[PDB]
């Protein structure tokens, strides 16, 4: 599917369908202050093509939304390139949310989770966040129904972490996926076979970098690669783009080339050589 840009959806769900063909959201996704919505508005609303968000996902005051299992069933990675304070996932004052249900979420590459003040929210104690975030120390998961819920799981890969039992499930009908330790963050197939080391979270076939659901490093021409090879540039810290792409952006921020990256603007101490979008340093003061 498409790569869509960061979005900020308020008041109406009309603009939410702009996401219908996205595989990747290159930016953040904020859905907020939806006071007109009811559960019926979300019974037939799904974005099954969405696999990854490069920055953060934020949900605040969205009426009638009871679970995210139908909205984002296949969301596998939130990269956290840019964060909301220090958070890659924010669920705040979500009036009717009964469960997260992000049963395909395998990795949050950078940043923490803040799930606060969700009066109906359950299925939180059942999630092993250590499988998703390296550091759960900065998680702030407080003031939810689950602070007594009666969370009931399908069968799940239950575990004891410290002295705490954690059943590892997202909903009454969805377990949390777990891979052998040898797979690290790469993911595995249903049979436990490791995805390629260039994959992140999941793959359709083992040990094949063209069969990844998402990439650990960079994406190029249906393949996960360690770094962008020439003549390509690193873009948004997840994909390889060509000069012409960076140039088209500039002529539509006015994007520049710097250290094999296509970026919004020249850093301090540099000026942009006009004929080739290239940041050049300033000998003496910058013009």
């Amino acid at each position: 599917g498409e790569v869509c840009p960061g979005m900020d959806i308020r008041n109406n769900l009309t603009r939410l369908h702009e996401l219908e063909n996205c595989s990747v959201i290159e930016g953040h996704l904020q859905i907020l202050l939806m006071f007109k919505t009811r559960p019926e508005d979300f019974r037939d609303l799904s974005f099954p093509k969405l696999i990854m968000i490069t920055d953060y996902l934020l949900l605040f005051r969205v009426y009638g939304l009871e679970s995210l299992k139908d909205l984002f069933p296949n969301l596998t990675v939130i990269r956290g390139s840019r964060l909301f304070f220090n958070y890659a996932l924010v669920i705040f004052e979500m009036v009717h949310l009964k469960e997260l249900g992000l049963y395909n979420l395998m990795n949050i590459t950078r940043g923490s989770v803040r799930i606060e003040k969700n009066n109906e929210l359950c299925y939180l104690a059942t999630i092993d966040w250590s499988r998703i975030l390296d550091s759960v120390e900065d998680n702030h998961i407080v003031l939810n129904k689950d602070d007594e819920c009666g969370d009931i799981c399908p069968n799940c890969p239950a575990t004891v972490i410290n002295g705490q039992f954690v059943e590892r499930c997202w909903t009454h009908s969805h377990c949390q996926k777990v891979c052998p330790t040898i797979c690290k963050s790469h993911g595995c197939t249903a049979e436990g076979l490791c995805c390629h080391s260039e994959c992140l979270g999941n793959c359709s076939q083992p040990d094949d970098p063209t069969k990844c659901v998402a990439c650990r490093n960079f994406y190029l021409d249906g393949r996960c690669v360690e770094t962008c090879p020439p003549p390509y540039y690193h873009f948004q810290d997840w994909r390889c783009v060509n000069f012409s792409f960076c140039q088209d952006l500039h002529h539509k921020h006015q994007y520049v080339i710097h250290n094999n990256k296509c970026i919004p603007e020249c850093p301090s101490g540099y000026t942009m050589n006009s004929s080739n979008l290239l940041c050049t340093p300033c000998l003496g003061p910058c013009p």
Binding site: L33, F60, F85, F92, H140
Partner: peptide, 16 residues
């Protein structure tokens, strides 16, 4: 923090 809380409070001083 209270800073996160305060960000939201302050946003609700927008027009809809």
């Amino acid at each position: 923090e209270s800073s996160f809380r305060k960000t939201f409070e302050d946003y609700l001083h927008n027009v809809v």
